[PDB]
Amino acid sequence: IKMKSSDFLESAEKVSLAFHRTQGLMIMKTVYKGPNCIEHNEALLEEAKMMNRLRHSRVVKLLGVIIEEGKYSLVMEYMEKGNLMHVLKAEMSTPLSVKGRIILEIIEGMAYLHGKGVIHKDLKPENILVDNDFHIKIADLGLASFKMWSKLGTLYYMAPEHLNDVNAKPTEKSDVYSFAVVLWAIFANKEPYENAIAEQQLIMAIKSGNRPDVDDLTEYCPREIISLMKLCWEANPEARPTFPGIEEKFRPFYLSQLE
Amino acid sequence: VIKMKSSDFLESAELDSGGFGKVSLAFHRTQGLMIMKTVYKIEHNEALLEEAKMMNRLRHSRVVKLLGVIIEEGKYSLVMEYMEKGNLMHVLKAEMSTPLSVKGRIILEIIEGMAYLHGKGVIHKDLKPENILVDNDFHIKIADLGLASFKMWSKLNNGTLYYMAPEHLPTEKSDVYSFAVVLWAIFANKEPYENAIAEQQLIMAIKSGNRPDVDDLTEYCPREIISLMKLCWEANPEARPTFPGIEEKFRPFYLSQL
């Protein structure tokens, strides 16, 4: 699964557009560039391997890597429209049925990740990438699951239990909460909590049970989805449903009500 | 008297900061291996030079010795002695079964070192496992490889969040907090707050009383050291003891128990 730096051409923009020589268009995240010094290549390759095993239509695929002297890159597949929040904020308003697919696809991808024991610690619209006809893939662009590559805002989507208790081990129910807030954002066409003055006031407000304003959302969003996000953003973790539990009810709903 | 030229060295080669800090390994024409920290490539020449002399005057077996300074043209660098095993955390991860008596040794020596530094009016503004260097026989020396505690050398240059005191997220109790987490780190064999996902999350968390998980630790670490780290990471900086206060209780405890 290895690659070379000579294989790619220039690139715009370090996240950059990597025109491969033969295979064509991809995106290159150069994680390190400099002296050479990096001693622990072995762990980097095994965790590239460990995240190469994640194979799904609804998850971003590691195309390859570059491990050479003064450069370290993760090569992933190009997604034409960018991230989800960019799509929503784009001047055309997306219809209900497309938003339905997006949501079902997010559920599919997460269920797969949770199937493989990978809890996403940072699920948010910036990690949901979109292709030309609105099909999505889930990424981890901050490398929160890849210890070693990291060794080379978000808070709106963080579950109460993790706020002011960093030793709490993330569970499946941590990103179900983040899913809830993604749902809001999908029908709100913007980031949540825009009226807050203090960030510390917000964090304590969120701990004590405050959530994004649904009053803004009732016009454009069906009731079954509004109930879903409230279930998912419960203060109690056990109160929240699993992704398979969401899938089982949301798939028949999407198919029969949204197309 | 302590000045060195670039041409005194044959070659230099960068080191991994995970193991050795932000440093290069150089070879002195007549003196062999040294580690060189190039900080920059007239302004504040006089202050920088005297600060180097301030750290040249730090002479203690458990503290890093400055060996020279390069100040020339567009290059300012510091030179220090070579420590082969690298920093503490690098050794703790590679050396699996580091026994209780050796970890006691290292803790006593960190305490010796810090009390000396404070005795010279030097407050470590960034104590952490990556600033604790290890020689071949597992003895330690305290360093400030970021040069946080030297006003002018840090500016020239212009990890830590885990060890910084909550009030600062510098008095004689600031680095007592850092030391507390070093104690945890020593018996945990790893950096703290592994589950923390965001910077700002971690800053508010620690600020409201969150601390490293002792449950990933209880069995390897003696109960007096658990009391010591709990005291040293109190939210209130007056509740924390001093390094001489710590040295007096820990020295005999090392001798009789470990």
Ligand SMILES: O=[N+]([O-])c1ccc2[nH]c(Cc3ccccc3)nc2c1
């Ligand atoms: O360079 N990158 O930024 C990058 C590269 C490959 C990726 N593969 C995924 C999918 C994924 C994996 C693990 C948990 C959740 C999602 N994200 C990636 C991000």
Ligand SMILES: O=[N+]([O-])c1ccc2[nH]c(Cc3ccccc3)nc2c1
């Ligand atoms: O090349 N360097 O970067 C370097 C050189 C000499 C040093 N001497 C100390 C000792 C010290 C100072 C202040 C607080 C604690 C310990 N650190 C050094 C770092």
